[PDB]
Design a protein around this ligand. Structure first.
Ligand SMILES: COc1cccc2cc(C(=O)N[C@H](C(=O)N[C@@H](Cc3ccccc3)[C@H](O)C(=O)N3CSC(C)(C)[C@H]3C(=O)NCc3c(C)cccc3C)[C@H]3CCOC3)oc12
Lengths: 99, 99
């Protein structure tokens, strides 16, 4: 699709068998989701931005369907105020910024 | 242009006659730049990112060029880790997300 930016670009994602709303975020290196269960090993990570840093769990090789497009990559789980789809998965669904 | 997301989407901006690097950030409502001198009066704003909230200075009707595209709009100044071009100016230069 072509998504304009008059409002926050939220889409529906499917992850870990759950449906969630998440923000298509070109300023995010990584993908971070609110607290949820994911399968496999995880490692601790600290990520930061406006306001400071937060502690998350890093899960690798996770599949997320993003607005109907499947991908696989790392997903961070932690106290993010908003679910965010970052560049690591945006590249995989073929997303670009155009002007 | 068409900007891919394999690396951080930095572009060169011009503001106050000076060239700076700034991140094109669809996850940001607003545009926020590192401490610099801007003309006119400012108003207080609180913005909230991944790690909490921060206090910034809001300057209105600021002349800014984004990858050669001329814009005039609201610019926030505050302790941002990097310069961020948010949706208020992305919309003005006609940027969309496409996949
Ligand atoms: C409490 O906070 C909020 C609550 C509810 C809604 C919103 C919306 C916004 C918003 O747009 N916030 C902007 C923002 O910081 N947005 C960020 C995303 C976000 C959106 C909503 C809530 C929280 C974060 C930005 O797009 C980004 O990824 N930034 C801005 S600063 C940055 C370039 C380093 C990067 C970053 O945070 N990276 C951290 C990060 C993430 C998110 C994922 C994976 C790895 C890392 C390191 C600021 C910046 C200028 O306008 C206001 O905040 C909210």
């Amino acid at each position: 699709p072509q998504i304009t930016l008059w409002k926050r670009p939220f889409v529906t994602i499917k992850i870990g068998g759950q449906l969630k709303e998440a923000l298509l975020d070109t300023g995010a290196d990584d993908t971070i989701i609110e607290e949820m269960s994911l399968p496999g090993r995880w490692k601790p990570k600290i990520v930061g931005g406006i306001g400071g840093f937060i502690k998350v769990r890093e899960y690798d090789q996770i599949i997320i369907e993003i607005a109907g497009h499947k991908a696989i990559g790392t997903v961070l789980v932690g106290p993010t105020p908003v679910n965010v789809i970052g560049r690591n998965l945006l590249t995989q669904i073929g997303a670009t910024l155009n002007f």
